[PDB]
Amino acid sequence: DPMRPAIQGIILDNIDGEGLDDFKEYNRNQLLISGIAKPRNEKEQQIVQQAQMAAQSQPNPEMVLAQAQMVAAQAEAQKATNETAQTQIKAFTAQQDAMESQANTVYKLAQARN
Amino acid sequence: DPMRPAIQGIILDNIDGEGLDDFKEYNRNQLLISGIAKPRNEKEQQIVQQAQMAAQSQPNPEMVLAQAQMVAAQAEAQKATNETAQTQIKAFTAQQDAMESQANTVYKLAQARN
Numbered sequence A, B: 001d002p003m004r005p006a007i008q009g010i011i012l013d014n015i016d017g018e019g020l021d022d023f024k025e026y027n028r029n030q031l032l033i034s035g036i037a038k039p040r041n042e043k044e045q046q047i048v049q050q051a052q053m054a055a056q057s058q059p060n061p062e063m064v065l066a067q068a069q070m071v072a073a074q075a076e077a078q079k080a081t082n083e084t085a086q087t088q089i090k091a092f093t094a095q096q097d098a099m100e101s102q103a104n105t106v107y108k109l110a111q112a113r114n
Helices: A003-013 A021-033 A048-057 A059-065 A069-083 A085-111 B003-013 B021-033 B048-057 B059-065 B069-083 B085-112
Strands: none
Touching: A003 A021, A021 A048, A021 B003, A048 A059, A059 B069, A069 A085, A069 B069, A069 B085, A085 B085, B003 B021, B021 B048, B048 B059, B069 B085
């Protein structure tokens, strides 16, 4: 369950003595980019948290790229959804031309009697 | 959890005695290329850290190459999204030619009476 890493992060944020500034800063960065620390409105809310929001929007193209194999199919089906209808339109045009040719050949039978 | 390697790296950065210069330097390199050491603004922030930023941008083509199998499909679908519409345009052109031929063959029926 998620819990246990969060409990360890909170514990390590407290405690500690000499020579642990870099380690504690590294811990707090991961603790606050995961929505557990509640930035205290000085620098991280606008620097590392905003970068975290960008990196939340950053890998959406990356992950849909791993899911674009059925997005190329989405696009192909979406366009074929309107392209093949040209065949219905062509059939309608051919029916109109058939009516024309019906009139024309009736006239042809009218003329050939002379 | 990540933690444990970071704790070991921090521990090994401290301590140590005679004849451990190369090992400690090798450890510190991996310690700051992973964003835990905070370069102390002398040489590494501009030499190895910049190279690591480049090597962060370096393998993006390498990894999307492992994900380009559905990027060739992206490109093919994207172009077919505008190429097949030539069939709709051709159907429109054929309809225009059909109405022209309607007028032309009506004229043909007009002339053949003499």
